[PDB]
Amino acid sequence: ILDKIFYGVLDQGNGWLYVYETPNQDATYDSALELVGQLNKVVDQLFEKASVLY
């Protein structure tokens, strides 16, 4: 499991093995964390231009 060669979980209170091959990842959600990240960096750059106003 730690190697993630089948990345399942072993239930030791019943002695059964579940194998999970399911995807827990989606492309959109990953790209979205980048895109939001870009905006935070940009908003800081904006802030400097607005110091003239203050």
Binding site: T28, S31, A32, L35, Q38, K41, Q45, L46, K49
Partner: protein, 153 residues
């Protein structure tokens, strides 16, 4: 384009201003030097307009019998997920482009700054355009699914 001869003897009699009397004075041209010689100086041009009735306008404007019933025609969701994925990815790269543009671009002479710090090839404009475009499409997709689920069953 439409032409009608003005005779050679007619040019000798200098009757050419007779043919432009009581017109808006708007005429057409096509390429210069050889084309245009023949055009104005040996025949005469008049514009062309297009005539129709309201019966014919309806005939052309119509389309299929499921073209006014094509908003219930949802698409495959594999395609709509392609659309969701492509837009978000691309905008990360034009955002990066946008970060570099606003680091500098604060000295004098706007056009100079825009040439130096890519401000021409404007990523600010491109980024907003893509976002709006995908934003309008997704409000209707949501609206389509919400209708078809509840309306049919």
């Amino acid at each position: 384009d439409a032409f009608r001869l003005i005779d050679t003897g007619a040019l000798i009699n200098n009757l050419e201003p007779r043919q432009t009397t009581s017109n808006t004075g708007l005429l057409n041209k096509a390429n210069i030097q050889a084309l245009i010689h023949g055009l104005n100086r040996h025949y005469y041009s008049l514009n062309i307009d297009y005539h129709k009735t309201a019966k014919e306008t309806k005939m052309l404007m119509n389309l299929h019998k499921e073209q006014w019933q094509s908003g219930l025609k949802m698409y495959d969701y594999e395609e709509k997920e392609e659309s969701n994925l492509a837009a978000t990815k691309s905008m990360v790269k034009i955002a990066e482009q946008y970060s570099k543009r606003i680091e500098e671009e604060k000295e004098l002479t706007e056009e100079e700054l825009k040439t130096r710090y890519v401000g021409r090839q404007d990523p600010k404009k491109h980024l907003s355009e893509t976002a709006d475009e995908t934003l309008e499409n997704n409000i209707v997709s949501v609206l389509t699914a919400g209708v078809n689920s509840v309306a049919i069953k």
